[PDB]
Design an enzyme around this catalytic site. Structure first.
Site, PDB file in Angstrom:
ATOM      1  CG  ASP A  39      -0.167   0.129   2.809  1.00  0.00           C
ATOM      2  OD1 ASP A  39      -0.948  -0.049   3.763  1.00  0.00           O
ATOM      3  OD2 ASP A  39       1.005   0.096   2.625  1.00  0.00           O
ATOM      4  NE  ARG A  67      -2.094   3.427   3.794  1.00  0.00           N
ATOM      5  CZ  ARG A  67      -3.049   2.498   3.543  1.00  0.00           C
ATOM      6  NH1 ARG A  67      -3.302   2.441   2.235  1.00  0.00           N
ATOM      7  NH2 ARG A  67      -3.824   1.808   4.608  1.00  0.00           N
ATOM      8  CG  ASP A  84      -6.816  -0.480   5.396  1.00  0.00           C
ATOM      9  OD1 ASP A  84      -5.798   0.388   5.285  1.00  0.00           O
ATOM     10  OD2 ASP A  84      -7.645  -0.517   6.010  1.00  0.00           O
ATOM     11  CB  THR A  85      -2.089  -4.511   1.438  1.00  0.00           C
ATOM     12  OG1 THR A  85      -1.400  -3.586   1.652  1.00  0.00           O
ATOM     13  CG2 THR A  85      -2.666  -4.046   0.000  1.00  0.00           C
ATOM     14  CD  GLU A 119       0.548  -2.076   7.303  1.00  0.00           C
ATOM     15  OE1 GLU A 119      -0.499  -1.956   7.747  1.00  0.00           O
ATOM     16  OE2 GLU A 119       1.583  -1.437   7.545  1.00  0.00           O
ATOM     17  NE  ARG A 147       1.613   6.895   5.202  1.00  0.00           N
ATOM     18  CZ  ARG A 147       1.240   5.820   5.561  1.00  0.00           C
ATOM     19  NH1 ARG A 147       1.628   4.709   5.147  1.00  0.00           N
ATOM     20  NH2 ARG A 147       0.067   5.733   6.405  1.00  0.00           N
TER      21      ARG A 147
END
Length: 135
Positions: free
Chosen positions: A15, A29, A34-35, A37, A81
């Protein structure tokens, strides 16, 4: 919204990417997803984290053109980010991840939610197909 060119510096996670944007190195980002992590020691390396991370990496490394698309709200998060939709050869990386069952649609914050519908339909299809996270 409009797309702007960017150059890959480094893929960091599923991500998160480091891009050259308007001549400066910047961490991005991926908006709305949402991946699992690979980083964060809160959990370490979640399941499908390496896969999500490899998928993002291949997709952006093998592209001819990378483009960033900012949404309508805040363009950076509290960590500095960039918050964007990323496109690899015209294909949205955020959607590809969700379509493959390698990311969930994130908790959404208006007004940064233009592609929310689109991504949720992709997520519903990946769930229906029981791909990766949904298997």
């Amino acid at each position: 919204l409009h797309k702007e060119p960017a150059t890959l510096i480094k893929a960091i996670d599923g991500d998160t990417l480091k891009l050259m944007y308007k001549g400066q190195p910047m961490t991005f980002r991926l908006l709305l997803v949402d991946t699992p992590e690979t980083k964060h020691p809160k959990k370490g390396v979640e399941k499908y984290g390496p896969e999500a991370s490899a998928f993002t990496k291949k997709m952006v490394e093998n592209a001819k053109k990378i483009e960033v698309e900012f949404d309508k709200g805040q363009r950076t998060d509290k960590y500095g980010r960039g918050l964007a939709y990323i496109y690899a050869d015209g294909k949205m990386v955020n959607e590809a991840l969700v379509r493959q069952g390698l990311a969930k649609v994130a908790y959404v914050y208006k007004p940064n939610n233009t592609h929310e519908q689109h991504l949720r339909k992709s997520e519903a299809q990946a769930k229906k197909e029981k791909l990766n996270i949904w298997s």
